[PDB]
């Protein structure tokens, strides 16, 4: 574990992010910005499902079959060095108290025993959410945690905002 919370950033395709995490963390959890049926049909979820492959997709599929929709689901990754995938569902369309719900979503990123995380900016498609709200909520959620977090995005704007709020 690190002595204090440590952040890294990466602006790039998931392949770049994962190469960086493999090199710099060695082992880590990847966070997926999931939906409650864990179907991975667009956005970063599609990228993660593409990267991790059919055993990952089928694990998610089978779990939701047995247990119904989920708001958080930690699965095998089927990729060397990726300790697990933590599939986190943020707030819903029409939800109130978005900052609160975003904070909860980022707190749901933590996985027992895991120290290193690769984390996307959650919930940008949700009515009422913007990346500044989301990154602020992330910082609130992780404050005091002795973990390493690689924040990633395709958008430099996002990481710039992270950088200025350090």
CATH number for position 88: 3.40.220.10
Owning domain of residue 115: 1-166
The Cα-based distances of 112 to 30, 37, 104, 147 in angstroms read 14, 23, 16, 11
In which element (H, E) is residue 47 found?
helix 43-52
Alpha-carbon gap, residue 86 to 34, rounded angstroms? 9
**What is the count of structural domains for the chain?**
1
Assign residue 5 a region (left: φ > 0; alpha: ψ between -120 and 50; beta: otherwise): beta
The Cα-based distances of 157 to 34, 91, 126, 151 in angstroms read 22, 22, 18, 13
Provide CB contacts within 8 A for 127, sequence distance 6+: 93, 94
Question: How determined?
Answer: X-ray
Core vs surface per residue 47-81: b (16+ CB within 10 A) or e: bbbebbeeebbebbeeebeeeeebeebbbebbbee
């Amino acid at each position: 574990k690190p002595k204090f919370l440590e952040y890294k950033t990466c602006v790039g395709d998931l392949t770049v992010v994962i190469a960086k995490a493999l090199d710099e963390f060695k082992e880590f959890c990847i966070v997926n910005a999931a939906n409650e049926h864990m179907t991975h049909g667009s956005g970063v979820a599609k990228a993660i499902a593409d990267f991790c492959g059919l055993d990952f997709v089928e694990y998610c599929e089978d779990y939701v079959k047995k247990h119904g929709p989920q708001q958080r689901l930690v699965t095998p990754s089927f990729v060397k060095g990726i300790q697990c995938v933590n599939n986190v569902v943020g707030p819903r369309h029409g939800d109130n108290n978005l900052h609160e719900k975003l904070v909860a979503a980022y707190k749901n990123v933590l996985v027992d025993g895991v120290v290193n995380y690769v984390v996307p900016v959650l919930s940008l498609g949700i009515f009422g959410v913007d990346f500044k709200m989301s990154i602020d909520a992330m910082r609130e959620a992780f404050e005091g945690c002795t973990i390493r977090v690689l924040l990633f995005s395709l958008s430099q704007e996002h990481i710039d905002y992270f950088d200025v709020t350090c």
